[PDB]
Amino acid sequence: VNSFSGYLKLTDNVYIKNADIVEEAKKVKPTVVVNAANVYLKHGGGVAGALNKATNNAMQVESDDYIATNGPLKVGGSCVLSGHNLAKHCLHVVGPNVNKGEDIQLLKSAYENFNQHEVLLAPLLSAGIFGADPIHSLRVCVDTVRTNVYLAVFDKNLYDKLVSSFL
Structure with missing residues (x-):
C-alpha cells in the first residue's frame, strides 16, 4: 500500500491521473519524482522549469555542479539527484x-x-x-x-484522451 490517491489503474503496474506533478510531489513526498530533463540539466520550462521553481532554484544550483563535475547526460540517460522539498x-x-x-x-x-x-x-x-x-x-x-x-x-483534455484511447 502507498499514499497515491485518485489514480486510474491502466495495468498491473501503471497508474495515471490528471495532476500538476509539483502539487502531487508536495503532497505525497514520494521516494522518487522523475524530471523531464535535458542533457545540460537546464531546467527552463515544461516539467523541469516547474519542478525547479518549486525548489526555489535549489534543483538548478545542484544540477549546475553535477554538470560541471560530470558533463552532459546522454539522450535516453538519467542521473539521480536530490528531491529537495518535493521527494x-x-x-x-x-x-x-x-x-x-x-x-x-x-x-x-x-x-x-x-x-x-x-x-x-x-x-x-x-x-x-x-x-x-x-x-x-x-x-x-x-x-x-x-x-x-x-x-x-498536466493537461486535462489530454488526460481524458489518453484514458479513452488506451488499449
Whole structure:
C-alpha cells in the first residue's frame, strides 16, 4: 500500500491521473519524482522549469555542479539527484526532443531508467514541449516500465484522451 490517491489503474503496474506533478510531489513526498530533463540539466520550462521553481532554484544550483563535475547526460540517460522539498530523490531522465530531431526510439531507453526504482511519480517522457505524441509515450511506458509508476498528466483534455484511447 502507498499514499497515491485518485489514480486510474491502466495495468498491473501503471497508474495515471490528471495532476500538476509539483502539487502531487508536495503532497505525497514520494521516494522518487522523475524530471523531464535535458542533457545540460537546464531546467527552463515544461516539467523541469516547474519542478525547479518549486525548489526555489535549489534543483538548478545542484544540477549546475553535477554538470560541471560530470558533463552532459546522454539522450535516453538519467542521473539521480536530490528531491529537495518535493521527494527524497529526483530521477532526471532525458527523453528525445523531437524539436531537436532526436530519434524517438530513444524513448524506450529513457523509460528503462524507471526500472531501477520500485515506485516513481513521473510525467510522460518526451511529451509536452519535447514534441512527441503523448499517446505513444504512454504506450512505450506501459511496454517498458515494470516497476510501479504513477503518471501525472498536466493537461486535462489530454488526460481524458489518453484514458479513452488506451488499449
